[PDB]
Amino acid sequence: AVPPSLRLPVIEAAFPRQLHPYWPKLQETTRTWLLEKRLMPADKVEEYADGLCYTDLMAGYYLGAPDEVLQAIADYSAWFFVWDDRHDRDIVHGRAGAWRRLRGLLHTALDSPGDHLHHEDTLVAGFADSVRRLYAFLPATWNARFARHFHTVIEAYDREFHNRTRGIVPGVEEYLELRRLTFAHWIWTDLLEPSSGCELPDAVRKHPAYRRAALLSQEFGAWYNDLCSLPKEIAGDEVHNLGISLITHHSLTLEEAIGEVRRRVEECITEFLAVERDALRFADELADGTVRGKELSGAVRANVGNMRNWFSSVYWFHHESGRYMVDSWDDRSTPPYVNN
Ligand SMILES: CC[N+](CC)(CC)Cc1ccccc1
Ligand SMILES: [Mg+2]
Ligand SMILES: [Mg+2]
Ligand SMILES: [Mg+2]
C-alpha cells in the first residue's frame, strides 16, 4: 500500500507495470559487477544491493532492449546511484579537493573510457567500463551526443556541490532548470535509442511531439523522486528538491509544498497523455512504405512506449527500493548503503 500523500491512482490504473524478461539474470549480473568493480563493500552488496532495486528500475523502463544493452544500462545506472552517494558524502565531509579531482576524471573518462578501465579510483574505473560498453552499440555520433549530455550532467553536480557548501537553495525556476541535468533527463532519453537499436536522426528526435513526450516522462520521474525522497533529503541536509525550493522562495509550509509538488507531478501525467497521442501519430506517419520508414517508425513507437514505461517504473521503484526507507535507519542522516 502506497502512502496516501504519494499515491497516484492514475499511475496505478492507467500505467500498468512491465518487466523485461532478462531481469532475473540482470539482477545477479549487476550485483556481481558492483562487487567486481568494488563500487560497494562486499558485505553491503550482500545486505543491500538487491533491496536497492536498481536493476528493477531499468528493467521496468527499457522494454525490448537487447540483453547486452540492458546490462550496460543497468550497470551504468547502479554506478550512477553510487556516484550520487559519493557526491553526497564528499559534500557532507567537505572533501572539495576529492570532488574536484573526481569531477575532472569523469569528464576525461567520458571522452576516452578505454583508457580508464583500470584507474585507481574504482568509481572512475566503473564509470569507464559501463560507458565503454554503452559506446559499442551505436555510431560515434550517438556516443558524442551521450558525452555532450553527460559533460553537462557532471557540471550540474558540481553546481550542486557548491550550492550545498555555500548554503544556497536554488530559486524554483533555477532549480527546475538544474533538475533536468541532475536527474539526467537527456541521458535516459539518449538511452532509448540503443534500447530500440536505432540512432534517430535529429529531424526525428527533435520533432516537437517526441521532444515533449520525452521531457514530460523525465519531469515526472524527477519531481516524483523529489516528492518521495524529500524525507531522506531533509534528514541528510540535501537542499536540491522542488519542495525545498518552494518552502524557501515561495514561503510554503511542508504540507503546502508536498501538495504543490504532487499537483505538478499529476499534471505531468495528463500532459503526457495528450502529447503521447501526437507522438504515436508521428510514429505512424514515419511508416511511409519504405524500409527506412518502417525502421524509424518502429523505433519511435518503441521509444515512446518506454517513455510511458518510465512513469510506472519510477513510481513503484520509490515504494520498493531500500534507498528511500529512511524510517528504518538508525541514523536518518546516513543511509546504511553509502560509504561513510
Ligand atoms: C541519483 C539518482 N538518479 C539515478 C541514478 C541519478 C540521476 C536519479 C533517479 C532517482 C530515482 C529514480 C530514477 C532516477
Ligand atoms: Mg541524491
Ligand atoms: Mg543527487
Ligand atoms: Mg531525490
Domain count along the chain: 1
DSSP three-state, residue 340: coil
Residue whose Cα lies nearest atom 2 of ligand 1: it is 81
CATH of the domain at 269: 1.10.600.10
Could you tell me where the DSSP H helices lie in 15-66? 23-36, 42-44, 54-59
Catalytic residue among 81, 137, 161, 272: 81
What's the Cα-to-Cα distance from 331 to each of 11, 91, 241, 304, rounded to whole Å?
32, 18, 21, 41
CB distance 313 to 17 below 8 Å: yes
DSSP string, 92-144: HTT-HHHHHHHHHHHHHHHH-GGGGTT-SSHHHHHHHHHHHHHTTSS-HHHHH
Query: Is 143 buried (19+), middle (13-18) or exposed (0-12) by CB count in 10 A?
Result: buried
Q: 245 and 169 in contact (C-beta within 8 Å)?
A: yes
The residue whose grid cell reads 512506449 is 305
What one-character DSSP code corresponds to residue 161?
A: H
Cα 165 to chain centroid distance, Å, stands at 24
Substitution candidate for ligand 1 out of 39, 75, 87, 183 with most atoms within 8 A of CB? 183
Question: What gap in Å lies between CA 213 and CA 208, rounded to an integer?
Answer: 8
Pocket (CB within 6 angstroms of ligand 1): 77, 80-81, 84, 183-184, 221, 225, 314, 317
Cell numbers at 224, concatenated: 516524483
DSSP for 169-206 reads PPPHHHHHHHHHHHTTHHHHHHHHHHHHT-PPPHHHHT
Q: Which grid cell sits at 145? A: 551526443
Instruction: Give the residue from 126, 87, 125, 131 showing the smallest Cα distance to 111.
Output: 131
Alpha carbon of 183 to ligand 1 centroid (Å): 6
CA–CA dist 329, 53 (Å, integer):
18
Instruction: Decide if 81 is catalytic.
Output: yes
Record the cell numbers describing residue 59, joined without a space: 528493467
Q: Which amino acid is at 120?
A: E
- Resolution (angstroms) equals 1.8
Burial of 182 (0-12, 13-18, 19+ CB in 10 A): middle
- Cell reading at 229: 525522497
Q: Scanning the structure block, which residue is given the C-alpha cell 546490462?
A: 71
How far is residue 255 from each of residues 190, 246, 247, 261, 324, measured CA to CA in Å? 36, 11, 10, 10, 19
Domain encompassing residue 155: 1-340
DSSP type of residue 3: -
Ligand nearest to the CA of 244: 4
Question: Relative to the CA of 81, which ligand 1 atom is closest?
Answer: 5
Residues with CB under 5 Å of ion ligand 3 are 84
Q: What cell numbers appear for 336 in the block?
A: 546504511
How many whole angstroms separate alpha carbon 270 and alpha carbon 266?
A: 7
Q: How many CB atoms lie within 10 A of CB 331?
A: 11
Would you call 274 exposed, middle or buried from its count of C-beta atoms within 10 A (0-12, 13-18, 19+)?
exposed
Experimental method: X-ray
Confirm whether residue 84 is marked as ligand binding: yes
